[PDB]
Design a protein around this ligand. Structure first.
Ligand SMILES: O=C(O)c1ccccc1O
Length: 115
C-alpha cells in the first residue's frame, strides 16, 4: 500500500510540481487554484464556466487512483487553466499565473518523457 506504482509516482510528481512551484519572490502560484469558491460566492463564474475545475478535484481523483494515464491528469489541469483564462482578463494576475503554471505542467510532463 505504502509503495506507489510508477504511474502513480509520475502522477504525483506532475501534481506536486504544479502545486509546489514558487516564483523568485516565494509566492506559490498554485494558491488560488487549490479550491474554487462556491457558486454563491462567484455567481458570474459558474454561469460562464461549463466544467469547473480546481486542484483539490484533481488531487482527489489521483488519490482515489482514478487517473489511468498522465494525459488524463494533464487534461484536467488544462481545463482549469483554460477556465481561469476564460473568466479572467489577459492582464489579470490569475491569467498570468495560469500561463506560468501551464508551462510548469508541460515542462514537467516532458522532463519525465521516459522517466
Ligand atoms: O479564476 C479563479 O479564481 C479560479 C480558481 C480556481 C480554479 C480555477 C479558476 O479559474
Amino acid at each position: 500500500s505504502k509503495y506507489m506504482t510508477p504511474m502513480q509516482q509520475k502522477l504525483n510528481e506532475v501534481y506536486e510540481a504544479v502545486k509546489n512551484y514558487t516564483d523568485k519572490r516565494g509566492r506559490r502560484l498554485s494558491a488560488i487554484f487549490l479550491r474554487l469558491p462556491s457558486r454563491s460566492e462567484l455567481p458570474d463564474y459558474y454561469l460562464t464556466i461549463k466544467k469547473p475545475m480546481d486542484m483539490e478535484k484533481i488531487r482527489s481523483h489521483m488519490m482515489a487512483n482514478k487517473y489511468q494515464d498522465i494525459d488524463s491528469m494533464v487534461e484536467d489541469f488544462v481545463m482549469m487553466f483554460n477556465n481561469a483564462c476564460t473568466y479572467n482578463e489577459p492582464e489579470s494576475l490569475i491569467y498570468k499565473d495560469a500561463l506560468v503554471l501551464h508551462k510548469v505542467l508541460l515542462e514537467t510532463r516532458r522532463d519525465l518523457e521516459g522517466d
